[PDB]
Design an enzyme around this catalytic site. Structure first.
Site, PDB file in Angstrom:
ATOM      1  N   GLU A 202      -5.360   4.058 -10.542  1.00 20.29           N
ATOM      2  CA  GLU A 202      -6.221   2.906 -10.258  1.00 20.29           C
ATOM      3  C   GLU A 202      -7.400   2.873 -11.212  1.00 20.29           C
ATOM      4  OE1 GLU A 202      -6.560   1.604  -5.944  1.00 20.29           O
ATOM      5  OE2 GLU A 202      -6.100   3.742  -5.655  1.00 20.29           O
TER       6      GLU A 202
ATOM      7  N   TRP B 204      -9.088   6.833  -0.296  1.00 22.46           N
ATOM      8  CA  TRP B 204      -9.478   7.531  -1.519  1.00 22.46           C
ATOM      9  C   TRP B 204      -8.585   7.042  -2.655  1.00 22.46           C
ATOM     10  CZ3 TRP B 204      -7.874  10.414   2.846  1.00 22.46           C
ATOM     11  CH2 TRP B 204      -6.517  10.806   2.844  1.00 22.46           C
TER      12      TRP B 204
ATOM     13  N   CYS C 240       0.793  -1.241   0.000  1.00 22.13           N
ATOM     14  CA  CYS C 240       0.000   0.000   0.000  1.00 22.13           C
ATOM     15  C   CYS C 240       0.817   1.278   0.000  1.00 22.13           C
ATOM     16  CB  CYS C 240      -0.949   0.024   1.185  1.00 22.13           C
ATOM     17  SG  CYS C 240      -1.774   1.620   1.415  1.00 22.13           S
TER      18      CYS C 240
ATOM     19  N   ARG D  33       0.210   4.663   2.775  1.00 22.62           N
ATOM     20  CA  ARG D  33       0.380   4.460   4.222  1.00 22.62           C
ATOM     21  C   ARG D  33       0.804   5.681   5.042  1.00 22.62           C
ATOM     22  NH1 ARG D  33       3.975  -0.784   4.622  1.00 22.62           N
ATOM     23  NH2 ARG D  33       4.523  -0.189   2.466  1.00 22.62           N
TER      24      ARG D  33
END
Ligand code: HEM
Ligand code: HEM
Ligand SMILES: CN(C)c1cccc(CNCc2ccc3ccc(N)nc3c2)c1
Ligand SMILES: CN(C)c1cccc(CNCc2ccc3ccc(N)nc3c2)c1
Ligand SMILES: C[C@H](O)[C@H](O)[C@H]1CNc2nc(N)[nH]c(=O)c2N1
Ligand SMILES: C[C@H](O)[C@H](O)[C@H]1CNc2nc(N)[nH]c(=O)c2N1
Ligand SMILES: [Zn+2]
Lengths: 411, 407
Positions: free
Chosen positions: A285, A280, A108, A111
């Site tokens: 993506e 969000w 991720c 973070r």
């Protein structure tokens, strides 16, 4: 044992000691690296050391290690395990655990935000209808009219594996996919199988390109139930381009809240099989994966035609050209409608700062390079030249089999 | 122990058996993956020789033949006697082709069997090395119709008589640090460039100066040679749409000729073995021109395109990045110099991977390196699971020779 990582752009060297606390396995051995492999009922026997290890971490973080409160809690948990074969986390521990699971998520890039997570305790939930109410509240809170806030809702933990709470959707908000008889797909190809399950369970599908799927919610091991998320709670953004007026006529839109709901949260040996969370979006993506993957909406050619690019040879770099314009569009549409979003330059730069800060204050930051590097423009982002160590800490988010493959149907 | 890799785009699954031959170590453990770390005697020698000879004779369908046994003892006798041994020409070509074939970080391996091997084991002096290198360059360049080649110098003996090419590539641009704090030319080459001035090179102090060769024969001190200018094919960089692009004054050479690696075959070590193929466009456009630590020209290009550089979210870097890479590919093609775009290269690699799984039981691949440095996920390799492991024969890195040379 001390490990060093180098940034080959800035020559900054960092030293990792945190990997020494790793328990779980990687999938790799001395003879093979499986770093690009996507996917590499529990006794009281194993449970107490897991509890103990988690509780030690928790009490250190509050600077109360070895205190009387710390010892009493260990004793308390110990007795609760041996008498009931499990135990209940305090709220302060649940919150700590959820934050730390995110903090430990090596794949991720977001973070830096880990300590700002709204944790909703849904462990008093008993039915699917109750799950629905909790999930509506999560969505409304997290959405916040466009000013997105990270949140997680945590349903009761697994007991015997036969009374699991599960959200069957992979994301709280996703578009239906429909296989047509001619072999083509309407909507999101990624969600065809799940869309079918919904239809079979009695969902009346509108059969459009952007139909928001219903929630399929399983409470306490019971058969899942369908619920429509109220449309007024589902924030969506129509996609337009700032320079290209024909872009809006492509008919594209996307939802604002990415909310992963199929993962398992492991805290101190306890397993939370329903723990939907949301942050969000990073723009790629949607723009790169959701729109431009061949196995998804696959709009590259159509965008490329409308830009009139030379599509006769890949060496014209038409795909790369269209990909950028699509990603510019996504960012622009979200910012114009004031829905929180982050570009991959900003997000990777923030991650590098996060990572360095973590090395100082924590002794490391597990990161999975294959996943941290954005899916376009990889090497002009600062994470590309950054060496990273991947290892697994607990608390953690884990994958779990899709519930339709395991669920024992009641009828 | 029998591993499966899935392609998530096409649902194709391949089963890997080849990894159960892996000899060297990866730097990973069950507790920590090091997948993104850039650099993680007679008794040693004979099993290495044997392992190699076995696969060679197996490739010519003569495993366990008399000629196989004969060679095995002949080499065995030689190791006992001479403490090393020499490869037959056939074995040398096989070894070199397989080292490329096994190079897990190389996206261009579909070409692996079409490698021209130049045997320079009879070379004794730096002047000889220069001649062989010039012949290699001319052969590979082939007026722009590039051909893959490797030139192999004598193997390591006692480590005091090493053949080394001191340059990292046969053809590279110099780097000079300016009193004005900046860097002139290629920043990646500042150190090597100073070592050239130290050994007496007369630098033109330009931005695109072809470095001279520093050649070390038989463990002796390295000598300077200048590659004949007429053998160095270069490409001026223009854009098929932006007239101003040429004014940036950018060029690059056509021949990528890696010269600092160590070729290991059957335990023998060839410390000087320059090899060459042709470029994938992003190597020049993305890494050479746009890496901060390199020519770093993104800002310049973006300015000339009149993009909004106030906010990252306008993706101006990305826009300029595409344009630079269009220009690179356009220039090489327009001059009829072989080049491949990352879409074509990765798609070839997928084909190759499938062939290798089909015909060899696997294909070691390093995803971090196979995936191009731009537009990753719109190429087929992105969605392709890969297993990384080390097979021999192999190319390895080795320390820069100046940190090790006894002057
Ligand atoms: C708030 C802004 C956030 C951003 C921009 C962000 C960004 C990302 C991105 C880009 C990925 C890569 C996944 C993909 O591309 O398919 C990812 C993965 C992941 N994120 Fe974050 N994230 C955010 C918040 C969160 C939160 C709140 C959580 C949990 C509490 C979280 C947990 C994870 C986990 C566990 C993964 C790994 C997913 C997997 O292994 O499939 N993220 N995130
Ligand atoms: C003919 C066309 C070729 C293409 C398109 C090609 C492509 C590439 C690319 C893009 C890389 C990534 C390196 C980087 O980004 O810095 C690479 C690495 C590599 N190539 Fe190939 N290559 C070709 C020929 C060759 C040949 C002829 C050999 C050896 C005989 C070779 C051996 C290697 C090795 C060993 C690496 C990894 C080097 C390292 O670990 O740094 N390649 N190749
Ligand atoms: C089919 N497939 C691979 C799939 C299915 C559902 C969801 C996803 C995306 N999961 C990756 C992920 C996880 C957490 C995130 C948190 C925030 C954010 N912005 N993106 C995330 C993406 C994949
Ligand atoms: C020292 N170091 C990291 C270094 C120095 C000079 C050059 C390089 C590049 N190595 C990558 C490489 C290797 C072989 C190739 C073959 C063909 C091709 N087109 N590109 C290659 C790139 C590294
Ligand atoms: C840290 C990482 O190993 C390093 O940046 C790598 C990433 N991937 C790469 N991939 C290729 N092909 N070439 C490179 O030089 C690099 N650099
Ligand atoms: C094969 C590989 O593991 C797989 O395609 C990965 C690559 N990297 C990724 N990176 C992100 N952020 N998201 C993904 O889904 C993937 N997919
Ligand atoms: Zn690994």
């Amino acid at each position: 044992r001390f490990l060093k990582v180098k940034n080959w752009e800035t020559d900054v060297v960092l030293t990792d000691t945190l990997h020494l606390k790793s328990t779980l396995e990687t999938g790799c051995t001395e003879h093979i690296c499986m770093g690009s492999i996507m996917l590499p009922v529990r006794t009281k026997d194993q449970l107490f050391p897991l509890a103990k290890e988690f509780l030690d971490q928790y009490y250190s973080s509050i600077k109360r290690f070895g205190s009387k409160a710390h010892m009493d809690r260990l004793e308390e948990v110990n007795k609760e395990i041996e008498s009931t074969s499990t135990y209940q986390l305090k709220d302060t521990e649940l919150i700590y655990g959820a934050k730390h699971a995110w903090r430990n998520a090596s794949r991720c890039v977001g973070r830096i935000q880990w300590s700002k997570l709204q944790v909703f305790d849904a462990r008093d939930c008993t039915t699917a209808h109750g799950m629905f109410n909790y999930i509506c509240n999560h969505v409304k809170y997290a959405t916040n009219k466009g000013n997105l806030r990270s949140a997680i809702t945590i349903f009761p933990q697994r007991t015997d594996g036969k009374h699991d709470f599960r959200v069957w959707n992979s994301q709280l908000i996703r578009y239906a996919g429909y296989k047509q008889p001619d072999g083509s797909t309407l909507g999101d190809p990624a969600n065809v199988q799940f869309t079918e399950i919904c239809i079979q369970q009695g969902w009346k599908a509108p059969r459009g390109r952007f139909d928001v799927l219903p929630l399929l919610l399983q409470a306490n091991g019971n058969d899942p139930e369908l619920f429509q998320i109220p449309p007024e709670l589902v924030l969506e953004v129509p996609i337009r381009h700032p320079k290209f007026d024909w872009f809006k006529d492509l008919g594209l839109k996307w939802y604002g809240l990415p909310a992963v709901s199929n993962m398992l949260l492991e805290i101190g040996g306890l397993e939370f099989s329903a723990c939907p969370f949301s942050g969000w979006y990073m723009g790629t993506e949607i723009g790169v994966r959701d729109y431009c993957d061949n196995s998804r909406y696959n709009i590259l050619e159509e965008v490329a035609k409308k830009m009139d690019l030379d599509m006769r040879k890949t060496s014209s770099l038409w795909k790369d050209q269209a990909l950028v314009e699509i990603n510019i569009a996504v960012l622009y549409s979200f910012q114009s409608d004031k829905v929180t979003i982050v570009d991959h330059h900003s997000a990777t730069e923030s991650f590098i700062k996060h990572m360095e800060n973590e090395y100082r204050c924590r002794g490391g930051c597990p990161a999975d390079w294959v996943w941290i590097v954005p899916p376009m423009s990889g090497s002009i982002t600062p994470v590309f030249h950054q060496e990273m160590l991947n290892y697994r800490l607990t608390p953690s988010f884990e994958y779990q089999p899709d519930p339709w493959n395991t669920h024992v149907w009641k009828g």
